[PDB]
C-alpha cells in the first residue's frame, strides 16, 4: 500500500553524465557511445546570448576548446558539430557504461524522471510532467543545463529531455536529444514567457484510480456522464479535453477497480464544481496531474527494471 511520486531508478543514466566546459561556461553533457551531447549555448558568452549566431560562434571553436571530464578523466574531443540546439562532441572513447537507449520525443502530459546534475555529477532525481504549455516545473539552478529526463522500458532508457533554461516564472524549458525545443522557446537572451497552462485530465483520472486502489473512495458517486458533457466542464475549468484514446488508455484501471471511465469522470466533474469540502485524496488537497495511467499501473504492480 501507499502511493508516492516515484522516479525511475537512475543508475543507468548516472554513468553517462559528464562535465563540458567551453571558455568560462560549464554545464553537463550526456556521453553515449563515442558522442557527448550538450546544449549549444555552452559556446556563448553572456554578450553572445543577446543575439547569438551559433553557426558563427562554432566556426571559431576547435576540438580542444571543449573540455570534457568524465569523473577525473579528461576525454579527448576529436570532432564537433551541431544538431539543432544541441552540440555533438565526438570523443576518442566509447562510453563503456552506455546502456541500451533510444532518443524519443514526448507529448504534453507524458511524465519522465529528471536526473539533476551539476559539474557532471548527478545530484538529485525527481519525477516531472511535460506541461500542456510545453514547460516543465523543474527544480534547477545555474549549471544544471544538460541535465536529462528519461523513462525506462525493461532495459532500454528512453531519453526525452535535455535541460537548457529557466523562464521568468521559474518554470523550465529544454529540448529533445535531437535538439528540438519543446514549446515556443528559443535559446536566446530575450523576453520569453510560458503561456497559460491547463490541467492534464487523463492523468487526474489515473490518480483518482490510484486513490481508489489505495482505499480513498469518498468522491465516488452514482452518476455517469458523456464525453461531450464532461468536456464542456473541462473547458470551463481549464482542463484538457478528454479524448476516446484517453478513455481507452484508462480501461485497465477501469476494470481493475470496477469503475468505468465515464463513471470516474462524473466524480471529477463534481470535484471541479464543488471542490473537496475539506477532504483530501492520497494526501493532497489539489487534484494531482503528474501521474499517467501507466505510472499508476507500474507503481501499483511493482514493475522492475
Amino acid at each position: 500500500s501507499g502511493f508516492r511520486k516515484m522516479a525511475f531508478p537512475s543508475g543507468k543514466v548516472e554513468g553517462c553524465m559528464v562535465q563540458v566546459t567551453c571558455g568560462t561556461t560549464t554545464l553537463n553533457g550526456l556521453w553515449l557511445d563515442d558522442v557527448v551531447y550538450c546544449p549549444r549555448h555552452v559556446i556563448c558568452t553572456s554578450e553572445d546570448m543577446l543575439n547569438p549566431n551559433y553557426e558563427d560562434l562554432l566556426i571559431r571553436k576547435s576540438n580542444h576548446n571543449f573540455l570534457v571530464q568524465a569523473g577525473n578523466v579528461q576525454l579527448r574531443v576529436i570532432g564537433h558539430s551541431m544538431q539543432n540546439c544541441v552540440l555533438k562532441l565526438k570523443v576518442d572513447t566509447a562510453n563503456p557504461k552506455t546502456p541500451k537507449y533510444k532518443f524519443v520525443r514526448i507529448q504534453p502530459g507524458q511524465t519522465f524522471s529528471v536526473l539533476a546534475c551539476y559539474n557532471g555529477s548527478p545530484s538529485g532525481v525527481y519525477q516531472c510532467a511535460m506541461r500542456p504549455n510545453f514547460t516543465i516545473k523543474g527544480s534547477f539552478l545555474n549549471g544544471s543545463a544538460g541535465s536529462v529526463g528519461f523513462n525506462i522500458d525493461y532495459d532500454c532508457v528512453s531519453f526525452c529531455y535535455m535541460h537548457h533554461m529557466e523562464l521568468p516564472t521559474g518554470v523550465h524549458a529544454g529540448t529533445d536529444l535531437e535538439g528540438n525545443f519543446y514549446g515556443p522557446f528559443v535559446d536566446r537572451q530575450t523576453a520569453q514567457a510560458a503561456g497559460t497552462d491547463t490541467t492534464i485530465t487523463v492523468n487526474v483520472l489515473a490518480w483518482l484510480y490510484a486513490a481508489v486502489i489505495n482505499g480513498d473512495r469518498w468522491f465516488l458517486n452514482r452518476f455517469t456522464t458523456t464525453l461531450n458533457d464532461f468536456n464542456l466542464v473541462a473547458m470551463k475549468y481549464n482542463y484538457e479535453p478528454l479524448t476516446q484514446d484517453h478513455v481507452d488508455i484508462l480501461g485497465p484501471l477501469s476494470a481493475q477497480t470496477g469503475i468505468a471511465v465515464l463513471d470516474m469522470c462524473a466524480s471529477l466533474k463534481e470535484l471541479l464544481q464543488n471542490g473537496m469540502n475539506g477532504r483530501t485524496i492520497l494526501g493532497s488537497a489539489l487534484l494531482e496531474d503528474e501521474f499517467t495511467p501507466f505510472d499508476v499501473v507500474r507503481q501499483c504492480s511493482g514493475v522492475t527494471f
Binding site: H41, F140, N142, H163, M165, E166, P168, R188, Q189, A193
Partner: peptide, 6 residues
C-alpha cells in the same frame, strides 16, 4: 520577460 540560461 528575461530568460536565464543555466
Amino acid at each position: 520577460s528575461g530568460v536565464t540560461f543555466q
